[PDB]
Scaffold this active site. Sequence first.
Site, PDB file in Angstrom:
ATOM      1  CG  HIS A 282      -1.932   1.116   1.129  1.00 27.63           C
ATOM      2  ND1 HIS A 282      -2.844   1.292   0.106  1.00 27.63           N
ATOM      3  CD2 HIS A 282      -2.107   2.145   1.993  1.00 27.63           C
ATOM      4  CE1 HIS A 282      -3.533   2.386   0.341  1.00 27.63           C
ATOM      5  NE2 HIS A 282      -3.103   2.926   1.495  1.00 27.63           N
TER       6      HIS A 282
ATOM      7  CG  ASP B 195      -0.934   5.927   2.092  1.00 21.32           C
ATOM      8  OD1 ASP B 195      -2.022   5.705   1.525  1.00 21.32           O
ATOM      9  OD2 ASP B 195      -0.600   5.429   3.206  1.00 21.32           O
TER      10      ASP B 195
ATOM     11  CG  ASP C  87      -5.750   3.205   3.556  1.00 26.09           C
ATOM     12  OD1 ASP C  87      -6.194   2.700   4.600  1.00 26.09           O
ATOM     13  OD2 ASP C  87      -4.844   4.072   3.535  1.00 26.09           O
TER      14      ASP C  87
ATOM     15  CG  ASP D  39       0.117   1.204   5.285  1.00 19.20           C
ATOM     16  OD1 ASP D  39      -0.692   0.528   4.633  1.00 19.20           O
ATOM     17  OD2 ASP D  39      -0.211   2.107   6.049  1.00 19.20           O
TER      18      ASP D  39
ATOM     19  CG  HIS E 224      -6.700   6.950   0.645  1.00 18.66           C
ATOM     20  ND1 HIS E 224      -6.295   6.321  -0.491  1.00 18.66           N
ATOM     21  CD2 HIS E 224      -5.902   6.499   1.637  1.00 18.66           C
ATOM     22  CE1 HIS E 224      -5.274   5.545  -0.213  1.00 18.66           C
ATOM     23  NE2 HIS E 224      -5.005   5.636   1.084  1.00 18.66           N
TER      24      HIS E 224
HETATM   25 ZN    ZN Z   1      -3.619   4.797   2.369  1.00 17.38          ZN
END
Ligand code: ZN
Length: 1000
Positions: free
Chosen positions: A61, A63, A175, A309, A439
């Site tokens: 994941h 970000d 997420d 993550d 997000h």
């Molecule tokens: Zn995230």
Amino acid sequence: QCQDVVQDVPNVDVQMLELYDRMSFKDIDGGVWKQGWNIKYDPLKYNAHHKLKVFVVPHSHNDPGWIQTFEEYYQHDTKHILSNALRHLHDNPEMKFIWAEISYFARFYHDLGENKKLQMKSIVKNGQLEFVTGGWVMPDEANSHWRNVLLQLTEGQTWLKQFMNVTPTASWAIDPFGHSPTMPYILQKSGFKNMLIQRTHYSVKKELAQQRQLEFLWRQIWDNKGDTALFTHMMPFYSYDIPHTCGPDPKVCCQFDFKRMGLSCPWKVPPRTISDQNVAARSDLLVDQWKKKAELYRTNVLLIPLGDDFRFKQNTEWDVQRVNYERLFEHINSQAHFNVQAQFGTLQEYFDAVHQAERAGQAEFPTLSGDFFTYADRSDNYWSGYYTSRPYHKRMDRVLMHYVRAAEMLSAWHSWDGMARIEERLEQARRELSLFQHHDGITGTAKTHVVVDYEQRMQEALKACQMVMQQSVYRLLTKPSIYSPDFSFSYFTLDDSRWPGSGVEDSRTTIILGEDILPSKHVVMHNTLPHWREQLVDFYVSSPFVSVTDLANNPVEAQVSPVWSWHHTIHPQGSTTKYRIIFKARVPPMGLATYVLTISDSKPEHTSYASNLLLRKNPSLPLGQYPEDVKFGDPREISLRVGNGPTLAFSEQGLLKSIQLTQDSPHVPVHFKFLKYGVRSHGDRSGAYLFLPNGPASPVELGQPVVLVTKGKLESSVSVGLPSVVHQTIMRGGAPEIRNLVDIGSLDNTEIVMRLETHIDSGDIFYTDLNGLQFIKRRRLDKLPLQANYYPIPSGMFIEDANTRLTLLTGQPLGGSSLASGELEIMQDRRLASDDERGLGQGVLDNKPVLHIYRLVLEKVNNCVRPSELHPAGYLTSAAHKASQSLLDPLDKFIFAENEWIGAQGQFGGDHPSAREDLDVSVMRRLTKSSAKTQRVGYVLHRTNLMQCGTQKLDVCHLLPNVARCERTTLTFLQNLEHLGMVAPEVCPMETAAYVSSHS
Ligand SMILES: [Zn+2]
């Protein structure tokens, strides 16, 4: 032949509003699976003929901004993850990996040597590295406008198609903090077959798990026929991490996260290397978890995500994860008593297998309509806070949304020379806006320095759009025989009276006119919407003696008001050197209109002057050359009417108390009031994510505030300096516009809400929109705490009984509710000293002045065809829709930079068809650079549905000349669905369709 979306109520197995009513939401301790139960399977379910097929899907994941910026994360983590993914998948042909965030993948792939790029292409070609969704980001689904959801999708898939010749048909959204049906809507019109979601309410996971309704055919809340349906997999457990993805007992699953041996297992039993000496016992433990998870699902095919993550960073994590799972698979598959085939797999592989099982008649799947808001991960920890967090950037999102649409539309009419750098600018603008859909972007759930990065990127994108728009307008309204551009030159500066707002930043330009200096000034208005629009526009001028003409020198009625500011006790001051000229621009569909501002000696024939009344005690204020003196008076009630439009009554603190629609009809009560929510002293603290109020909101002490009243023939307003909020009601002869300059300052542990109190007989029913695409019926549930009755307000909310409706339209996504019959409320800002323990690791203490904008539409609906009382959808009136349109896509204003404009024409697009009011050209985008044989231009057409209460055909294939070809496409423009001769048939209510016209 179109669906009726009003009279017919779809039949679905699960309707989320209905499910919500009949749900107890009991937070029972379930055992090892804290929020479910102890799962049982009959072990004779499985045998050599009915085996369990297990796809173990490694993922990471990533970000694009959260704790670090995009570029920080890239350098620290993601480039190492994608380098190692390249190396390991190359060397290990059975090893697999899925990737979602194309923003990071494009950053990486462009930096590779040609050898690496072809090695990368080989592992994507043979399906080892599989792209899931293929969006620029994994977007927010609460606050995001559907247009920007499609933009970020379009940008990631176009990049994938161009550079990897692949278009993902399976979505991965692990997420986002709750899930919108807007996503299946867009995905199913973008060629998708399946989608996966994770963050739904634990009580919803339990309820659906109990009926094996975690996989479902997700259709829109109005779709009777089911053409919108997309196969959805809802993950059953608390997290997407390895402890919550192997099965119901995280204490067991954590032992199969082989990276956790400076990471450990909270349940205090570590992973152990798999050996011939323990593989039998580990496999028994693991397969038991798998078979418990399989009980929750209808096929003999099981999805086991393997990640977390920023996982698969170090080379040894790849080894330790791969080698241990190989040993387990080797043992499990060789040992018949398990009756399991287990292997590394991708998401598409899972869904293919599940479909094969459906075909074979092994399983039949239920249908679902509704959304998955508001999300709770445990107890009363509802994530309604991020519906409001960092409201400045929430506002900025909607402004950039429009500037990208306008820039793409204006520059689309023509092919440009590459020296102009139109394509460079639009690509930057699309990508910064696409990145903000993340997000942790629009949500306001990123660290202070990351929010700063997002702001600076969107700032740069706004400047890129301005440059494209002004170049475009100069080209569209300069005689071809004269048009001789300097692609580096500013022909127009843009005037925006709503972003950032004078009072956030005093930055609007003053048009300086003089009988000698400069007597006249060309202004141009753009109308991105595909119908004739007439809208009041304003500019700053250096003299109040200004008259407006079109280019043909026809007078235009105008009004001049003073320029007012607010200062600190909070009082207004007026300019002695600048004035607002206000007049009605008439602009063609997708068109431009030119006007001239000319100075004179004195009060010109066709310009009126507003009066000014400063309601306070102990009054005085000059206004330089402003010809009507400022009057004074003690606080008192005040009525105002503009045009034949409504009559508004205001308190003596300048807050709306009443609207009279028409001259006969009654004074309907409508009270505006500011309140506060606080934070809990004991137990769970509100944060960037969580809304955890200490009880109902308590009124704000207003004192006696200074009320400024400006009364004019075209526009009047009532403004007041409340503590935290300069509140303003603007009247132009229809639904008024509300403006709040919100400065929460340093009121730590405070949330400022704005509530409307009516006698409307709403009951427990209100309506809120999803992504500015559809309105969904809410029910206040007294069985749930307050923060669970808060929902996203991305573009509007409304209450109604049999006779009256009140609709509040927003220029920005904020959180809101109807906490009692005839109320609406919407949060303006929140300042929070405490972190809410979801990994942000700070509170929200970076608040700044934002100008929030609204339209307030009181209407009678007794004569409107309202949908069935069982329907889960609402529909706006024409007046409310047009009011939303005025907030999100207003006219653009262009001031000519130079003293003289040779070649000037007074109009563009007078020939353009004026489409029905419910139709919009959401996107106009030229798809080809100049060097290209055949110019191609994409149009997204969205048609809403308006409540009927008792226009030329638009064919975008013909908008541009020399049309050779015309396709109906996916919304990404990436796949042709239908050759059309070359007319685009118009689209059904609540439908969206894309077309690409080709040119010879
Ligand atoms: Zn995230």
